[PDB]
Design a protein around this nucleic acid. Sequence first.
RNA 1: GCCAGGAUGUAGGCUUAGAAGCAGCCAUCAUUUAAAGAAAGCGUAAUAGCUCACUGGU
Length: 67
Amino acid sequence: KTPPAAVLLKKAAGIESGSGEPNRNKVATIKRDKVREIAELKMPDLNAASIEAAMRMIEGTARSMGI
RNA sequence: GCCAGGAUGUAGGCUUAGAAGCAGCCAUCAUUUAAAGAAAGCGUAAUAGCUCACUGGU
Ligand SMILES: [Mg+2]
Ligand SMILES: [Mg+2]
Ligand SMILES: [Os+3]
Ligand SMILES: [Os+3]
């Protein structure tokens, strides 16, 4: 595996922790720039077809932690 | 009924000595799918294992 979506997103987002997500979003960050990048690096471990799918998943982990 | 799948990010986040689907608090997305819950029970110290939901076959 490579750094989990969580840590990748943490380091990306620029934080050391997650949240209570729906309520207190922990930070914002640029998708088409950043979420895509992570989607790229995480690809060897993603069962995704297109990068666009690879993304949907990453963005999906960002929600669970609120970003 | 019986046979076989029940999966990937991922041990979701947080918290917690541990907290991994299954103490508790937030959520509960998305992927690849014929289908397959951020899991409905049992199980574990935590893991693992087992079932269940859904799908195929007969
Ligand atoms: Mg299981
Ligand atoms: Mg899963
Ligand atoms: Os089995
Ligand atoms: Os689905």
